[PDB]
Paper text:
Here we present the cryo-electron microscopy (cryo-EM) structures of EttA from Mycobacterium tuberculosis (Mtb), referred to as MtbEttA, in complex with the Mtb 70S ribosome initiation complex (70SIC) at the pre-hydrolysis (ADPNP) and transition (ADP-VO4) states, and the crystal structure of MtbEttA alone in the post-hydrolysis (ADP) state. We observe that MtbEttA binds the E-site of the Mtb 70SIC, remodeling the P-site tRNA and the ribosomal intersubunit bridge B7a during the ribosomal ratcheting. MtbEttA has a conserved ABC-F architecture with two tandem NBDs, an arm domain, PtIM, and a basic C-terminal tail.
Therefore, we co-crystalized MtbEttA with ADP and determined its X-ray crystal structure at 2.9 Å resolution. In the crystal, the asymmetric unit of MtbEttA-ADP consists of a domain-swapped dimer, similar to that in the crystal structure of nucleotide-free EcoEttA. In the crystal structure of the post-hydrolysis state of MtbEttA, one ADP molecule and a Mg2+ ion are clearly resolved in each of the four NBSs in the domain-swapped dimer. To measure the conformational difference, we align the two structures of MtbEttA in the post-hydrolysis (ADP) state and the Trans_R0 state based on the NBD1. We observe a ~40o rotation of NBD2 away from NBD1 in the post-hydrolysis state, allowing the formation of two new salt bridges (E199/R499 and R216/E482) between NBD1 and NBD2. In order to evaluate the effects of such a large domain movement of MtbEttA at the post-hydrolysis state, we superimposed the structure of the two NBDs of MtbEttA in the ADP state to the 70SIC-MtbEttA complex in the Trans_R0 state based on NBD1. Clear steric clashes are observed between the NBD2 and arm domain with uS7 and uL1, respectively. This may explain why the ADP-state MtbEttA cannot form a stable complex with the Mtb 70SIC and has to dissociate from the ribosome after ATP hydrolysis.
Author numbering:
A (entry chain B): 4 to 552
B (entry chain A): 3 to 551
Write the structure that this text describes.
């Protein structure tokens, strides 16, 4: 009410000292302003004092409110004495009290009954205003602040004396908005004590820029921290401010520690040899039950990073493919392919465009059926899968509406995830979450479909080029999510780093001119598959070639 | 000597600034991978460097005589040529000369002409010495390895992916001096990406590749250019080095935040204690000089980013003895009949309004002034740490660090070695502030300089005159802790009541009356205890602050 700043910005050239400051001060509010030197504190006070106007935005004083400012070079009436300066702060009441005392000392030398009537009117007016308590408060203030002798000329006074006189005048003018720039300057400790006890009961609102911590703990109701033009309000006094700031630091530090462990795992992986990489992948293949038991302890996730919630427990039979033949019209895509998918296995599917990878996905899910052979999926298996071409029939639904179904929390198996954070983890941050599904780019639709795939509880995750439109950071996040996932996953991707980092197996197209539909099943990652391919077929035939059919 | 230079480059579309004062110089043959989230500005940088767009401000210059090629989201292809024809157009004149050589070769088969023989020989000289016959072979190798469409297909029927592959092949065979790739792994299978990476590793020209393909960034890039909201951050090294640097700077930031959190929690714990409990740390000092001295005189490492006071010589039982001190100037007395003993490990807070004799008391203790009556005795074990409050220095060009360090990077002060740069940094002179000349220092900067000069003298009795001046709350706590761990005595003049309560074992307070204007009181306890005792002794009105006569 008493003052409002809306998108206020203040700059002198390249230095931005106020940056979209938007604050609303309730009447009588006590704010202490803190921040390093050059943060912008005195500029805020000067704008609120009406000495400065912002370059952009609205800086508005409540109409009918009064303002007073204490600044480094305080303005004093140089043609008036100390007591005169301090008296000038108070308005009409001081002139009427001086007139009352004048008529009082006039009625002893002279008399007039109309002077008595004037005195009765003045007494009523001043009693209705508590004028004599104001003169008493003037004397108490001048005494407690160690003001100079009340009849001294203010031109000869030093900076400290002038500052004390200005502070006294300002305190007695009692503005509705009181602005103090380092008020404890040139005050002794007991004077600071008195000033603090006085301003604690002060009626108006106060903006005090000070490093005096007892002042900030005993006077401030809000702590306004300024830093390079941004303003961070903290509700409470100085101690509450300490508590809240320490908590914000602790939270940010926990997040940074998570990121630290993930960055260190990525560095350790890239620096490791092939022996340790095969050790790690086969070890993953040998520890499904331990990981599942551990992961089934969690029942909620604060989705700061991508995490894949554990699904149902898996049996030994996951996916069994036996002599699979599959094609369309006269062109065969797969001929006589057989493999068994082990528990905790990550399969990388690789091959050129149009050879049958998505067709294999659809045969596994059962939207397509084999022309020969068998694809058996265990009764214990639950699929997480979205069609790559998934399109929404309602174009008006926003990304968050599509993923969350309107709910603040998403159930994924036994795990609860906050929907806003979940959708944010896939690159939809802020207003991107409100973008309608009908106007999504190809990459936005890809990330939407990935989020839709992973919110399905399951132990077999099917991913079709999930690296699309992800940055390197989110790539590492998805890698970590897969490395901590207890179920199985089949992944189509051209990202070789991802394949080497996560896959225990490779299923690769190796079609020939004679047989376009041969595939090879390999235990190991992409680099091991390529080396084995060179060893198996020779370097010239392991090289990529254009496909003909 | 620089294939491309950007100087103060700026790009904006209305008010949205997408490139902001980018200043980069790319040397010929440089391999840069460009990373960053969507909308950071990567494609805009590529278009500027390709000459497709010009910046609003600044210099964006391709080296004269150099060639540039760009792979963009909608690559332009000339529909009037076939796949092979489009890809051949990239090589240009050399391909036309080789086609002429083959034309003459198949012309000499139906009829001969000796003019054809000399033309063939002349062609052979240029094609063998300044060209390579294998250029057509590598053209076919690229079309095969990138899995281009059939070499004889019209490019009108091609899909977006086939068009992309044809464009990439054409671009690779045009061999520009600056090669710009915007998401080059798009529409490539993993084996095609492997071939592209191995091909670009041996590529002669310079490459700017915007890609999230981390094996590319690790095996091709020599620099990692990270873009963020129009800002450009170059990191020297490949992807592994980039990860290393990111993790280490994150670790540094985390240690910084943990330091700040610990200071916040320790300060909160102190303020949340009762009035008695706040005194515990300072009161413990009075019974533990010998333990504290034994600890401080053991050699350990020290965090010199916090305030540190090197321990001085050991103190005897007699520190400072003042007996019936009378002191004044002209006919005005400042101190009358003051007697006190300073205990070892004692910290004395001197309080009183301006001009009552605090600095003169300091000067009597140090001996710059002598008593008018009484005695001030300083123990034979005492070494004073003190600088005059008005210290300025006659050489204005000497910098802050030059003044403090006397030119030494490491200073011996007793048994302690201090790094001068970190030491002076602890007092708020960070970075280029340390090189600021002494003649242009503000009042607060000069106060902090004088404090840093005071604490490096290695005495066991420290005299500080308003040392809180121009210190932020963090450095205030740092100075507090430094004093609480110091094996010796300190006498401190200050108006900061938080400081006094946290550090003082004694208070020396001015208590002048109308009858005796030079009366002082010595009290065992901190500021708050002194005030409570003052009310107990004098009454509420006489304990209140008053004007000095
Ligand atoms: N009238 C002005 N002209 C140029 N620069 C100014 C002006 N007023 C303030 N500044 C600059 O703005 C920054 C913030 O100043 P100020 O608000 O006084 O900082 P503090 O937080 O120390 O009060 C400072 O670096 C100062 O140099
Ligand atoms: N329903 C269908 N009917 C006929 N042919 C199809 C059908 N679906 C896909 N195909 C053909 O199968 C080939 C490969 O399909 P797909 O597996 O989707 O490609 P990719 O191998 O890139 O995943 C394509 O050339 C396409 O023409
Ligand atoms: N012609 C344009 N008009 C307005 N804004 C544009 C234009 N081109 C690019 N931008 C803006 O510039 C920002 C970054 O552009 P760009 O370099 O294309 O993204 P990226 O770095 O992901 O390739 C985007 O937020 C985009 O909105
Ligand atoms: N050398 C001197 N000659 C005359 N008067 C002095 C001298 N030094 C100090 N004074 C006076 O003694 C009083 C106390 O000075 P000082 O102890 O510096 O005050 P404070 O306690 O505020 O530091 C001041 O009013 C000052 O004018
Ligand atoms: Mg200021
Ligand atoms: Mg597909
Ligand atoms: Mg782009
Ligand atoms: Mg002084």
């Amino acid at each position: 009410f008493i003052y409002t700043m809306k998108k206020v910005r203040k700059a002198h050239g390249d230095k931005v000292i106020l940056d979209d400051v938007t604050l609303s001060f309730y009447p009588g509010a006590k704010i202490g302003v803190v921040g390093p030197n050059g943060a912008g504190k005195s500029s805020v006070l000067r704008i609120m004092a009406g000495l400065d106007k912002p370059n952009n935005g609205d800086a508005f004083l409540a109409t009918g409110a009064t303002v007073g400012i204490l600044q480094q070079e305080p303005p004093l009436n140089e043609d008036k004495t100390v007591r005169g300066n301090v008296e000038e702060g108070m308005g009409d009441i001081k002139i009427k009290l001086d007139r009352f005392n004048e008529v009082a000392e006039l009625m002893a030398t002279d008399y007039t009954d109309e002077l008595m009537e004037e005195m009765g009117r003045l007494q009523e007016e001043l009693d209705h205003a508590d004028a004599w308590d104001l003169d008493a408060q003037l004397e108490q203030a001048m005494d407690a602040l160690r003001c100079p002798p009340a009849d001294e000329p203010v031109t000869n006074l030093s900076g400290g004396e002038r500052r004390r006189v200005a502070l006294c005048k300002l305190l007695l003018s009692k503005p509705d908005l009181l602005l103090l720039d380092e008020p404890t300057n040139h005050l002794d400790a007991e004077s600071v004590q008195w000033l603090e006890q006085h301003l604690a009961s002060y009626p108006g609102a106060i903006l005090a820029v000070t490093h005096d911590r007892y002042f900030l703990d005993n006077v401030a109701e809000w702590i306004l921290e300024l830093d390079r033009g941004r303003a961070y309000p903290y509700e409470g006094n100085y101690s509450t401010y300490l508590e809240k700031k320490a908590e914000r630091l602790a939270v940010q530090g926990r997040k940074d520690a998570k990121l630290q462990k993930r960055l260190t795992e990525e560095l350790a992986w890239v620096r490791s040899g092939a022996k340790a990489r095969q050790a790690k992948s086969k070890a993953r293949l040998q520890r499904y039950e331990e990981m599942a038991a551990e992961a089934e302890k969690t029942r909620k996730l604060d989705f700061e990073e991508i995490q894949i919630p554990v699904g149902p427990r898996l049996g030994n039979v996951v996916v069994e493919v036996d002599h699979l033949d599959k094609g369309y019209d006269g062109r065969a895509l797969i001929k006589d392919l057989s493999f068994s998918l082990p528990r905790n296995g990550i399969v990388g599917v690789i091959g050129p465009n149009g050879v049958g990878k998505t067709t294999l996905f659809k045969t596994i899910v059962g939207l397509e059926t084999p022309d020969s052979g068998s694809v058996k999926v265990g009764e214990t298996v639950k699929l997480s899968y979205v069609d790559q071409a998934r399109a929404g029939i309602d174009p008006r639904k926003t990304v968050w509406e599509v993923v969350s179904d309107g709910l603040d929390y998403i159930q994924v198996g036994q795990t609860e995830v906050p929907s806003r954070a979940y959708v944010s983890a896939f690159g939809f941050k802020g207003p991107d979450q409100q973008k309608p599904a009908g106007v999504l780019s190809g990459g936005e639709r890809n990330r939407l479909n990935l989020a839709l795939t992973l919110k399905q509880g399951g132990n077999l995750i099917l991913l079709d080029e999930p690296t699309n439109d992800l940055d390197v950071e989110t790539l590492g996040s998805l890698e970590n999510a897969l490395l901590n996932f207890p179920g199985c996953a089949v992944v189509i991707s051209h990202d070789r780093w991802f394949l080497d980092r996560t896959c225990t197996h490779i299923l690769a197209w190796e079609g020939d001119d004679d047989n376009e539909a041969k595939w090879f099943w390999f235990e190991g990652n992409f680099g091991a598959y390529e080396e084995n391919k060179v060893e198996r077929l020779g370097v010239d035939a392991a090289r990529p070639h254009r496909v003909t059919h």
